[PDB]
Copies of this chain bind each other. A is one copy, B any other.
Amino acid sequence: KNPKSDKFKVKRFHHIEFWCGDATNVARRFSWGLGMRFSAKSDLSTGNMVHASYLLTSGDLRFLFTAPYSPSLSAGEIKPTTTASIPSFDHGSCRSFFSSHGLGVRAVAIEVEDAESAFSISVANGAIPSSPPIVLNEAVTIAEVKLYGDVVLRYVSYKAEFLPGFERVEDASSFPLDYGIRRLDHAVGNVPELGPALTYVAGFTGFHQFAEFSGLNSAVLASNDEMVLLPINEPVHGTKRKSQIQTYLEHNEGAGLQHLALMSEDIFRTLREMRKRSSIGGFDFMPSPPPTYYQNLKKRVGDVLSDDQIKECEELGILVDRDDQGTLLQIFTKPLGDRPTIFIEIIQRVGCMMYQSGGCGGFGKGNFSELFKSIEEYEK
């Protein structure tokens, strides 16, 4: 069931902003490891004495990497005469963020029709304001409320090139890499208590629980057309294996986002390209499933994927789940940085054509039991 209770008009995921201490080095690692292009910058070259910001794009996916300069560069400035292109930025908050959390996402941004309305309605509905609505160059409105931990939900709205004050990267500095990734599918937070976190963010968005049929307990909030998908996990204590959610909270110094799931139009090409670059600057992937997993996949998705295709999934380590309505292909990278905190999921969904409806196939929770049982079988 979908009550379509969105309290304001939301469109799509717009961009993800990482806060780091050196934007250049994270951005170039990410661009090579993921096949994202260098498309827009805001930094000293563009008259910004406050922060360094570099945008990577693959299809509709927008990764923003931001780090502070020395405050001495902008010490004469005040907020009305700032040279920062993102007005919510703050040296102290950014430096506090990176040194408390290590590398991670500071903002999950969604495009809305009216970011000032979206902010007002949100705050009026219990959201903790983080940055008030600012109109950039009479063209773009930007507002931030608190989401969880030190992560903020960022509303952007356009009257009619990323943001005012970003210049387009000169073609000789922009190499057209592409491994297949096309858009952000979902962004997942880890919190210590799911209940209050659910009722807080559902309370100011009007997002509804998405029907989702060892480790955690979770639930997924979804906008009206279920294209903005915001899962949230909490740990399940007292087990035998320590919950990854609890390890996350311990190493992250509290609540934050666990993973970004990126949609590829061809998860097979994507993972071939990403695996080729794993050990030369790219990303590592979590260990593969035991062949007992793939020896049981023919019994479950043999109607969706052929024998050659299922064997292909065995090569790249791709996991496969399926809904009552769709099939899901997924795989998890190792953590993106020093700490065992944030990671990336590559996915592709099969089915639910009307366009594809959001969340087709679910989120892979079955692959936990498919993995445990598959481990037992291989042990033999």
Return the chain B residue nearest A282 by Cβ.
B28
Check A89 for interface membership: any CB of B closer than 8 A.
no
Check A251 for interface membership: any CB of B closer than 8 A.
yes
Least CB distance, A85 to chain B, in whole angstroms? 15
Identify A70's interface contact among B68, B100, B173, B177, CB under 8 A: B100
Kindly state the separation between the CA atoms of A23 and B339 in the bound complex, as whole angstroms. 10
Identify A69's interface contact among B38, B69, B95, B338, CB under 8 A: B338
1/0 per position for A43-65, CB-CB distance to B under 8 A? 11000000010000000000000
Q: Would A98 and B21 count as touching, CB distance under 8 A?
A: yes
1/0 per position for A3-43, CB-CB distance to B under 8 A? 00000000000000000111111101111110000100001
Across-interface contacts of A31 in B (CB, < 8 A): 280-281
Give how many copies assemble into the complex.
2
Identify A337's interface contact among B25, B30, B95, B99, CB under 8 A: B25
Q: How many residues of A contact B (CB 8 A)?
A: 47
Q: Would A22 and B95 count as touching, CB distance under 8 A?
A: no
Kindly state the separation between the CA atoms of A356 and B32 in the bound complex, as whole angstroms. 38
Check A253 for interface membership: any CB of B closer than 8 A.
yes
Check A174 for interface membership: any CB of B closer than 8 A.
yes
Q: Would A339 and B28 count as touching, CB distance under 8 A?
A: no
From known contacts A26-B22, A31-B281, infer whether A251 and B338 are also in contact, taking CB-CB under 8 Å. no
Return the chain B residue nearest A102 by Cβ.
B22
Check A81 for interface membership: any CB of B closer than 8 A.
no
Kindly state the separation between the CA atoms of A100 and B175 in the bound complex, as whole angstroms. 32
Q: Would A29 and B70 count as touching, CB distance under 8 A?
A: no
Across-interface contacts of A20 in B (CB, < 8 A): 21-22, 25
Kindly state the separation between the CA atoms of A25 and B24 in the bound complex, as whole angstroms. 10
List residues of A whose CB falls within 8 A of some B CB: 20-26, 28-33, 38, 43-44, 52, 67-70, 72-73, 95, 98-100, 102-103, 172-175, 177, 250-253, 279-282, 336-340
